[PDB]
Structures are given as structure tokens and as C-alpha cells.
Design a protein around this ligand. Sequence first.
Ligand code: CA
Lengths: 183, 175
Amino acid sequence: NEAATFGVAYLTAWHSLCEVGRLSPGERVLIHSATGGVGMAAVSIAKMIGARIYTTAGSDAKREMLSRLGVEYVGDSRSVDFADEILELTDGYGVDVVLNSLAGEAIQRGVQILAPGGRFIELGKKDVYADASLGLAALAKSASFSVVDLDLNLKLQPARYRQLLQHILQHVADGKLEVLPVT
Amino acid sequence: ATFGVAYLTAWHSLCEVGRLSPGERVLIHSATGGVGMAAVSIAKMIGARIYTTAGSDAKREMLSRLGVEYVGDSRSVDFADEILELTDGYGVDVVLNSLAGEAIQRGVQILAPGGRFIELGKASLGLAALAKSASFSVVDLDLNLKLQPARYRQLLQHILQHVADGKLEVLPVTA
Ligand SMILES: [Ca+2]
């Protein structure tokens, strides 16, 4: 129940960032809608890893609540302004991995700010990119586009996720992973 | 391709980016080439099921003696249906690709849920085809070496340790 929402949020953030994103220490990770379940899980895990965290949120209170967590950036999730704001903040480097859950122009804008070796991770529903396409030139600089549908993964590899969920809980249990709160 | 370029390309594409796992299915195009053969060696070590492709009879015959799951034609695109038919519609878990044009589109189409298509080679990509937790990754070794020489220098030592340990049997290029 509330036990499933937590598991689903942490399994998605962990699988996306650690296994598919290869997020390593000091890398820059852009997390959209960071205040959401999956979003705070991603921030939490990102802090465990030691990455540079760039976030995004829809209201002042939520954005203000993210800046209190001590992140290097907090943008507007309802806008595309984040792309230029981040390029300006990193002198053009951009980001190494993007945990995306936003629809529209944000997908194109997100890919565009990937630094060489960048990883874009799509968590959005199949309808956010259904009839859409990606120009392979955008990935030329050793970049990648990865869709992650946790609901599907669970069905196909139930056992592999039960152990990953114990693995994560063991981390929290022992204090190697701090579960960050909302407010 | 030299040993360094072959194994660095293959290991970074199959292990780091590709995440090849014991039992998974991997399609390796032009498998008799340098990168291709390093790719087969690493797959062997991992314990993956190997699906290959080669540009001539002599080369396909060479792949067959290695004992693999499939040996198709790289100057064709038939490999897509032949594999779906051979794997009962499952398709493949990861595709190491160096072929062009339709081979890519057809190669992305046969990824199994959770599939990883690594493009080594060289043109849009329909995102719907990546819906079942699939991905598309471009690997440019030269660019990578230039940007993270130290990380790659260290990966080469990691690979060479496996070779020295007898864990990674290096299959020679029968060319
Ligand atoms: Ca400027």
C-alpha cells in the first residue's frame, strides 16, 4: 500500500540512476519533478552516490523545498528555460544524465543538454513519445536514450527486483542511504 | 583494429553500456572483425547466447566453428526475421551494431523487452520502438579516449587482468 509506493519509487530511481544511468560520483544529474515520489528517491540516491544534483519543480513551495536540500540548481518543471539556465550554469557542459518525466519540448531540450557520454532516461508514459522520434545526430557524442517502464520490468523479472528491493532496504536500514523527506 | 581498440570498444559496449548478462542473447554484426571477435570472446566469458553476422561464406564458416547460436548474412537484412523465427519471437537482448541503413531500423525492431542497441558504427529513430524498457546508445571510442584517457587506461588494465587470469580467452582474428 504505502509500502508499494515507496518500493516502486525507490526501485525506479535506483534502476534508472545506478543500473541504466551508471551515475557515478561528481557527475551531473538533472532530476525533473524532484518533489514527486520517484523524484525525491532519485535525489536521495543521488546524494548517496555523490553526484551534482540539478532539479526542477512546478510551484514555489516545492522549488523552495528543494533548495533547502542543498542542490546546485532548481528550475521550473512547467518550462523549458532549464536547458539554457543549466548550460549557463555549467558554461556549456550541460548534464551527464537526465531523469525525465516531463512531456513535450522538454524531451528534445533535455537531450540537447547532454554532455558527451550523456544518458537520457525516459520515465514518461508511451504517449509522451509515441508518434515522436529522435534524430540520431543528437546522440553522436557517445550519448544514449533509455526508456524505463518499471511496471513492465517487475512482471518480466519479479525475482530480480525482489532482491534489488532487499538490497535497497538493507542500505536504508544500515544508514548508507538516507530517505529524504517532503514537507 | 588493434587489441586495445578491439577490446576497449567491445568491453565498454557489452559490459559497461550493454550490461550483457549470463544467458542473455547478443547479436554481434560482422563478428569476424577485430571488435567483432573481441565481442565474441567477452560474450563467451560472460556466458551469453551468441548471434552473429558475417560478409562472406568463408567468414560465416569461421564463425560456425566457434560454436554460436546463429550465423547470418551482414550484406542482408534477413537476419531480423531469421532471429525472431529462431528465438520464437523473443528477439535479442543486446545488439552490437556496425552495419548501416535498414540494419539499424530492423535491429532496433528485434530488441526484446529491456533490450539495449549499441550503435558502434558511423537518420532519425522512432521512440515507440524503445517503449518496452529499451535503449539506444552511440559509442564513439575515439571521443571517449580523448575525454577520459585515464578511465580508459584503467579499463584496459582491468581487461588485461582477466586475460592474464585465464578468465577472458582471447579468440584470434582468423582473417
Ligand atoms: Ca553565457
